[PDB]
Symmetry: D3
Subunit: 278 residues, 6 copies
């Protein structure tokens, strides 16, 4: 009635060209196979944001640094997931099909190699990040062990509206892939717990780890129960594997087990819904 | 450039008649004066939910157990705040002016004895609570030391929309008065920090303390910085006084520290604004 | 697939006569009803060691301070468990039927008022405790929500052999009722966690709380999951109620996910009744 | 009236041949000398399980990946311990003299170069590990500063029977060497504390650290006093050195300072008889 | 080679007359006897600041609220220490022998009823306290289990100079009796550990506990090793008893195993600290 | 009304020649520009003790391993601070101009390339380290965001007299650069908090990180507010950047909001009579 997940504190890539991107793809694929062989019960492996292409702010919007989703790169992730019989969560900076600014995209591929979820980062900064605000909403898919999976990216997890939307659409597991520097390590751990408790929802969250010559990324893979309690917490080392058994049915039971005023008392909800938030 | 606050882990009242309510009123007033005498720099004293009338679930909706707001009881609180020259936050189970179900209400009195804020609990802690959902929204007032104050009540603080609404209306300090049992102590501490960080806002929160024959209320007064860090934390003893210096203009400065996508991507935000959150 | 438990950090009784014992019985009975009223899903309520009779070391072996198990006192506990439809765990200093030193005894009563488990402390906290070492082994019974319950008492939980015996007999939930002073608060939390992990077992543990004129009892009700993680932790105040939902099937499932000869001389010696440091 | 110990969070070896083993041996030798040079008072240096030969699960039972104990490899460890005048704890996967499945072995060498303790892992986890269960019991030797040393390996420390056996045979310091992945970091710290408290015994424990291409080993060298309190705790970085002063006579005094002999535990009887079902 | 100590998180007295002071004396003496009976190996029992007279700021400098040290009140403390064969640490607001402002005083009585240490608070918690700055320096006495004991009071433990002076005079155990409100609980724990580590010294510290109508006193008895590690930590409940075994010769062993560059040391020594 | 600082858990250098020292210099300079690039608001970057020359105890007193301060090496640091417009804290083992034993020295350089503070370690730990006891007292300089900066080195922070001296001379921010092994990680964190609280002062403290073949240096950059509370805490990984906003004016405000000495140790210490 549960499933095993592995969160990879993937070493922050230093990417200077497409050749480095191909190297990251091969390393990710090797990590899928090796982690499954080490954890035979594994069913969900999670890689952090920017694990495929890095954070080269001088080049990360050039054609060389962008991919299509799906594309040859996700096809390779999908073949690996199909051979290891795991769900996989991956990060791809996506070329905008309409020619505009690219997207910050995450995907879930199931043990049959099919892409069952594509999400575009809703909340880019946008001081440092150039990505276009996601336009696919916050999707939810069926995962292992009776899970309803949703993915959010980096800053998305700081907005309570993101985790709220995931659970509202049926998710009982929220996956968060990030590429944060050590500056928000504390706030990272805090919102992972509150995102879980406020929605009676598991949170699986992992960040890049190590030093890329500018920032140190804190890693700190984190699994939180649906009561907001952290079950397992990784440290700040590259290649730490944070594993945990997750029982999505208990989250569902809590929501079912635990005529009312339907009107909205919050001005910010009205302004936000109508695009007048200021 | 800041102000000193005191959070009172008031002993849970055991109330069987109006006479017991009168005893709580005089005890609350005595606490205002004595706490000011002990902390001469004090400017904001905060009492928990149900500190005036208790939680006698068999009589707490009877006319004898309810008050009008304002009324004789808040007038006495007002005279005390005026004599001690402090802002005070008080809990009153309020008779419904139209004879319906009563309100769970909080008020802020200023050092002049004027009632500057009246709030009615937006999210009654169903199903054990019979209070009508508040109809005054979430107000904000000016407080000491350049603060913009907002109050919420108990269950309110579990909804990130509440703290979001307070900050959206200009509050840089959120006050949370509570009458929780020990069962949500962890979740209490968690949300008081997330409410602070997510909105770059101070949170001052305190609960009743002690045993009323049914529940043990955990007290645990808590002050959180606008980065989500807990500054001061009380334990579970009755009459613990949690004090802290708060600097509202640092929260303002942090908040101030093309144009942005205005479209709403959250279906729950639309449905809630439409009164159809389901 | 789980059940709700409430651990009562009962105030340490100050008892100087049988009327004071009767007083504790009434408060305990009333706590059963009130806690069920507050937590309508409650199925297991746990009271600490000595919660019925206190720790009057100058009188606690006199006949006035002892009870029979079962007896009129447990009958009153049983009626309350029936009326509130809960399992209850209670402490009784038991008169020795042969007139010897009394037993330190714990019982579990089910929602129909039947005593489904009787246990006598195996490891009296020597040299300050006068109780005879228990002679009933470590029994296990069926409980709420698919649980297999075992109870141990105070010093028992410091011996890993106790938690090991409970699991070996099928228990997936170990209950520990205690009347420790503040001196062993840290070791109390440590062993409650290791007792859970080493046996893939839930541990529900609660101690007396408050001051009786000699010791301060630390309370600190504690629920640990089968991986040794503390789920809920009370502080040291009298009347703190520590609640938690427990899922015994998850422990069972964890156990089903997993030489013959003995390498331990201490196991051989103990089995032979010759354990000697 | 104590001694200084150093726990080496040795980087997990990636071993594909005997040449890679030889490099671990040299690196271990180098670490003995360098650590003594940095900590002149050092008397006990501890290396984790698999620090000599790694965890190449495809080759770790081949003749190339095995050693005799004692053999040329332990003689090199012995020369280094003798030159640096320290006690050393080492891990060697041992060729079975009978033939058959090899052993997971740990040895202690004294400052004179003599092998004073040889232990074969008693609980070698059959699903993943091919090692034959140890057949030398749980030995104890004299150590520095009046210590009585015992060693256990990895999974051994999860069984409270192991720490109990060490203390029963007189050990006042239990050394634990392991090669765990990050999955049991919490349970590792928990059992290291309970092993100490339950037996009024110091525990010195250290794991491999770093990533071998499959698992991340958490390192986290840990010293616990005889009350169960963690005195020093390492993090998860390779090459972290966890040092502490240990006072074995304090554990002896606690046992000296601070009855029914029959066995009430059915699991003790069954295990002693090889009937543990 | 050690001794057992008990720190009493004594309930804050509310005192309106000298009869109420006699009530606290009564209660303190009973606590001495009961704690010893419960902990037969006990050798050092510590009571917090103001445990005898409370903090009635309207009356605590009136003659009715003050005692002589020694006097009839410490005589009763002494007889109890002799009857239970323990060292005891007590707090007395002391009448100034010259009629000036009273002292905030602490004493140690040995198991023979002899007062072996008298100390007056050097750093009155200004501006809320009216006590005269102590004029007896920081004395050190012989204690149980090979200990060299020193006592400091409340605000004293915030100044690293106090703990340094204790160790400089040879103390290997610093006792800190306090009557703080909850406002400085964190800083209380911090300095108890730093006082210990910086001087390779045990610290035994305890505060009043409970509510007196104005402040809540946090209790939180604390024992720290000479490496700065907290060995035992009480919570905030009245009557919590924090016990620990202490090994003074291990601190001695750790310690065993010129010009001044600090202007503040110069100015302080010169009495010109500005 | 504050400023942003960055503490570099700089990897412990393994130095065997002058060439390696120059490699550390270039690496430190690169880290200045890259850190400023990532944290545009940065105003104070701090590097640990021995970050320039390592801890080769068999060569760290020879002429090749020593520099003059100011010297060509400070000039390169000063230039880098000027291009990035940051305050920089650097460690340099200084050649004693009197020919005696060398000094263990720390300097502060402002965003204009001016060396505004020079400090020589006061408590060099005689058994292991060879450096002469500092003879410049404990200086204090003006820093960013209204800060009054002081620097101390390694063992200095274990003596409460050091933090007190800084505050007494006006410092509201004490900087601590260190090259400790893991053995005193706990005591390191403890004294950084007490140093802060006892003097109503911020403490900014960072250590080397990683393994040099003898010791593991714990890094663990730490910022403590003037109430003794740790605001940010790094772990033990090389190259962790510990950042924090610091508000010196609130330490000043907290400080604004019988005179004879009762301590025999103060008297003896002041007179050189301390024993």
């Amino acid at each position: 009635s549960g499933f095993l997940t592995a969160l990879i504190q993937y070493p922050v890539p230093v990417v200077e060209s497409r050749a480095d991107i191909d190297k990251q793809i091969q390393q990710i694929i090797k990590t899928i196979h090796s982690t499954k062989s080490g954890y035979p019960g594994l069913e969900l492996i999670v890689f952090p944001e920017y694990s495929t292409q890095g954070l080269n702010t001088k080049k990360w919007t050039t054609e060389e640094f962008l991919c299509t989703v799906p594309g040859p790169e996700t096809d390779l992730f999908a073949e690996a997931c199909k051979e290891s019989k795991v769900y996989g969560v991956f990060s791809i900076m996506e070329k905008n099909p309409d020619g505009g600014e690219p997207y910050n995209t995450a995907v879930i591929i199931d043990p049959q190699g099919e892409m069952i979820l594509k999400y575009r980062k809703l909340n880019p900064w946008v001081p440092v990040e150039p990505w276009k605000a996601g336009d696919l909403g916050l999707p939810v898919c069926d995962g292992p062990g009776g899970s309803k999976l949703a993915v959010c990216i980096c800053h998305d997890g700081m907005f309570p509206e993101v985790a709220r939307e995931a659970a509202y659409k049926g998710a009982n597991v929220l996956i968060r892939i990030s590429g944060y520097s050590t500056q928000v390590s504390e706030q990272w751990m805090l919102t992972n717990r509150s995102n879980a408790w406020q929605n009676l929802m598991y949170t699986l969250s992992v960040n890049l780890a190590g030093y890329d010559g500018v920032f140190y990324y804190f890693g700190e893979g984190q699994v939180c129960n649906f009561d907001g309690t952290t079950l397992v917490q990784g440290h700040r080392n590259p290649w730490e594997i944070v594993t945990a058994e997750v029982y999505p049915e208990l989250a569902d039971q809590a929501r079912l087990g635990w005529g009312g005023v339907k009107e909205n008392p919050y001005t910010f909800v009205k302004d936000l819904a109508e695009g007048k938030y200021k």
